[PDB]
């Protein structure tokens, strides 16, 4: 639909944004754990950060654009305090036109017939590249970019007209997205530039984002229980939550399209030409409320029908803790897969622990791998289930005040294992350190993320807001760090993370992710240990657990492509950010890989019964890969229970 520069709407800051800016600014400047001055120097850093957010791959803006703007780079502080965010806005707007200019240019390049057999390469990290000096450089980068894309599709193996067709819909889509940009999109971005400049865990959440975060925290949402996908101009219903309003109604189906949304005493609003979030916002509402939907049925027919539904509270069970039993002969081991430290998690675990007693599970594994964290209280309470009494964690503000958090007894007294990885962080680290510090449980996995701070989540809404500005939308929220957290040890998991008692092979490899790689992450330090009584002592059992574990992985087939996969991964990291761009070589590498991929499943089968059959099952099903870390962990868990039993 958009073909010209004048079809790009000029983004304008909303009426309430200034007020919000001011509110975020007050909070960040006065109450952050990090005491910084929002002076000219700080302001320039924010500007630099904003530019990277705006053009991550230094692909769209010209150095002349950057330099024009840099003249007012130290003005950012005055703007945030004032809330008159012109440079953030003026810059975003220029970026829009530049993006459009770029995409339109790419539209041209695609038509040029080029299929290539050169040896020229592409680098994926343009993060620190100097801005394009001129249009020539810009076109050249984009010439390079389009090549990369077509080449990637060709690597799938299509035609050239297809690839053109596929890429055409992509560059065009990107153009549409630009025209759909919000004032909010810019405001959120500007706040994030500011927040992240302070520390890695500080954020501004827009009203919609705030709602989402609350939902993740609570496992619940208020609306109709339907997952929505946008295809072209249409909001399509992908799936329906079981027990939810849309599903229980029997008047709505998967594949149905929502072209209209109606509030109770108002007209049905056509939402064909809308952003997904704007539509979802109309749909969602307070429980007990009613919404009417204009639905275009899934077929080719043109007739529409109106469905009215009563909004209600829906729980996202998928995000809840999950329990399973692993059986190895006579022995059983229970497993709790915890996605996050959501509010109410401890309660949920208690019932699961209760079920486990019934099954006479010998050991319990708590799976925190990839658990980002959550509520601090939840971390403390979850810990309390396994530990009789005492402090779980220590918190300290910027002025040295130290507090210790503890629980109220023990819900489960048995052998316990905590499984962690590089992505298990914060609350997960707190729980893991505590189990370890008290000698309560053995920790298995990869070294942790290294999170060591506490954030305060506070709404920006004020009580008189509705009264004086009914027309305003909701304001968002902020999360800002207020304290550092320490183990009962006096130790800190900031930067370091927690080191598992037993470490998986991926564990000893140099990690490229973590708290330590984030911008402006706070330094590691320590405090005096608190007073607590050890639950038990597992240090004795370690050499035996180690050797037994070591012997098992050595034989294990799955635990070997991991080893071999590792050295091999080591071989190419240097060239990691550079891809070949030669149609010939990638396939050698590519099929050299597919081949490797389509093979080693066989040594495991032959080792076993074998499991299944495939001379080449080159086209497998929807494949669920095995989980060796967990399977080995379970093996470790049984070893632990055996030893504890022999005390």
């Amino acid at each position: 639909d958009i073909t010209r520069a004048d079809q790009i709407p000029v983004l304008k800051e909303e009426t309430q944004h200034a007020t919000v800016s001011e509110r975020v600014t007050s909070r960040f400047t006065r109450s952050h754990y990090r005491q910084f001055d929002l002076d000219q120097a700080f302001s320039a850093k924010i500007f630099d950060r904003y530019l990277n957010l705006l053009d991550y791959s230094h692909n769209v803006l010209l150095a002349s654009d950057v330099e024009q703007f840099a003249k007012k780079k130290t003005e950012l502080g005055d703007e945030l305090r004032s809330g008159k965010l012109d440079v953030f806005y003026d810059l975003y707007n220029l970026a829009q036109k530049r993006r459009f200019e770029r995409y339109q240019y790419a539209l041209s390049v695609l038509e040029k017939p080029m299929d290539f057999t050169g040896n020229d390469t592409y680098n994926l990290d343009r993060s620190k590249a100097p801005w394009p000096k001129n249009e020539a450089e810009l076109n050249a980068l984009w010439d390079s970019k389009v090549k990369f894309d077509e080449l990637s599709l060709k690597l799938t193996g299509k035609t050239d007209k297809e690839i053109r067709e596929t890429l055409t819909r992509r560059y065009k889509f990107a153009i549409r997205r630009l025209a759909q940009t919000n004032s909010e999109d810019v405001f959120s971005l500007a706040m994030t530039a500011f927040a992240r400049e302070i520390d890695p865990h500080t954020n501004y959440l827009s009203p919609r984002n705030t709602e989402q975060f609350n939902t993740e925290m609570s496992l619940s949402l208020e609306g109709i229980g339907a997952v929505l996908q946008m295809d072209d101009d249409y909001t399509v219903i992908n799936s329906m939550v079981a027990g939810g309003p849309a599903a229980k109604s029997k008047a709505i189906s998967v594949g149905d399209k929502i072209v209209g949304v109606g509030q109770t005493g108002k007209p049905m609003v056509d939402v064909i030409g809308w952003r997904l979030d704007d539509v979802v916002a109309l749909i969602k509402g307070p429980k007990g409320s009613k919404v009417r939907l204009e639905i275009l049925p899934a077929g080719k027919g043109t007739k529409t029908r109106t469905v009215t539904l009563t909004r209600e509270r829906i729980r996202l069970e998928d995000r809840a803790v999950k329990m399973s039993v692993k059986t190895v002969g006579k022995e059983k081991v229970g497993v709790l897969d915890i996605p996050g430290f959501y509010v109410g998690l401890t309660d949920d675990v208690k019932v699961q622990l209760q079920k486990l007693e019934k099954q006479n599970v010998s050991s319990v594994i708590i799976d925190l791998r990839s658990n980002g964290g959550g509520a601090l209280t939840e971390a403390v309470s979850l810990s309390g289930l396994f530990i009789p009494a005492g402090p779980i964690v220590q918190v300290r503000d910027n002025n040295g005040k130290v507090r210790e958090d503890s629980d109220t007894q023990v819900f489960y007294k048995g052998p316990l294992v905590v499984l962690v990885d590089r992505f298990s962080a914060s609350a997960s680290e707190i729980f893991a350190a505590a189990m370890q510090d008290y000698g309560r449980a053995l920790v298995v996995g990869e070294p942790t993320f290294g999170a060591g701070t506490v954030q305060q989540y506070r709404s920006l809404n004020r009580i008189y807001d509705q009264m004086l500005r009914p027309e305003w939308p909701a304001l968002g929220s902020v999360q800002y760090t207020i304290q550092k957290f320490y183990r009962v040890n006096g130790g800190s998991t900031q930067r370091k993370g927690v080191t598992p008692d037993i470490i998986m092979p991926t564990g000893n490899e140099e990690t490229e992710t973590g708290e330590k790689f984030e911008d402006n992450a706070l330094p590691w330090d320590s405090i005096d240990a608190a007073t607590y009584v050890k639950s038990g002592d597992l240090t004795a059992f370690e050499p035996e657990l180690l050797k037994e574990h070591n012997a098992r992985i050595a034989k294990d087939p799955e635990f070997q492509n991991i080893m071999k996969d590792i050295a091999r991964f080591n071989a190419m990291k240097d060239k990691r950010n550079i891809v070949s761009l030669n149609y010939a070589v990638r396939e050698k590498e590519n099929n050299e890989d597919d081949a490797t991929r389509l093979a080693r499943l066989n040594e495991r089968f032959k080792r076993e019964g074998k499991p299944e059959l495939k001379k080449l099952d080159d086209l497998p099903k929807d494949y669920q890969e095995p989980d060796p870390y967990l399977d080995e962990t379970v093996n470790i868990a049984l070893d632990l229970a055996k030893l504890e039993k022999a005390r």
Binding site: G374, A375, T377, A379, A425, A427, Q455, Q456
Partner: peptide, 6 residues
């Protein structure tokens, strides 16, 4: 609330 996440 006090959050220890991400």
């Amino acid at each position: 609330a006090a959050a220890a996440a991400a």
